[PDB]
Design a protein around this motif. Structure first.
Motif: not given
Ligand code: NA
Ligand code: NA
Ligand code: NA
Length: 158
Positions: A12-25, A29-35, A128-132
């Motif tokens: 959950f803490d891995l730096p994920l390199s994105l298209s466009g040059g930013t990173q996310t983890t 994304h806590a608090g919202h659904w992620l596909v 899920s919003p709580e990372g499950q």
């Protein structure tokens, strides 16, 4: 209880390199659904079809407050070119070292060519919003897939 897959905490803490040059983890994304949809190769027929299918449904994912990420091990530049050519309005993760792929166990082996061959198996997950990880699709059939993922998301989000 509702998880179908357990990820290492560090995932959950891995730096994920994105298209466009930013990173996310994933934690970001806590608090919202992620596909999270994994695909084997940028700019190939099945991968392009799948990306375009998710892209067409973005407003429906937005209605549910969800975000989407596509993932392959292609480079950031490859992903930038793929997004620009296809008009994708969601980010692609450049998982060059396959850290995210391994966490979701999508690197599968096949005895072929007299060798043990490892590669990305097309797979999708709902976080899920709580990372499950509450739903998984493996060995994905592209036709109908994004529609099925949206339907499942709506059912879960209740
Ligand atoms: Na392309
Ligand atoms: Na999430
Ligand atoms: Na499933």
């Amino acid at each position: 209880t509702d998880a179908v897959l357990e990820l290492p905490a560090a995932t959950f803490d891995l730096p994920l390199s994105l298209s466009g040059g930013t990173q996310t983890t994933l934690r970001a994304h806590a608090g919202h659904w992620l596909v999270i949809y994994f695909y084997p190769k940028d700019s190939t027929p099945g991968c392009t079809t799948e990306g375009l299918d998710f892209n067409a449904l973005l407003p429906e994912f937005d209605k549910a407050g969800a975000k989407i990420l596509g993932v392959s091990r292609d480079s950031v530049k490859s992903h930038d070119n793929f997004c620009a050519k296809q008009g994708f309005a969601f980010p692609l993760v450049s998982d060059g070292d396959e850290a995210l792929c391994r966490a979701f166990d999508v690197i599968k082996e096949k005895n072929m060519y007299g060798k043990q061959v490892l590669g990305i198996e097309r797979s999708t997950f709902l976080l899920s919003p709580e990372g499950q990880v509450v739903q998984a699709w493996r060995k994905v059939k592209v036709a109908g897939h994004a529609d099925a993922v949206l339907a499942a998301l709506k059912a879960h989000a209740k």
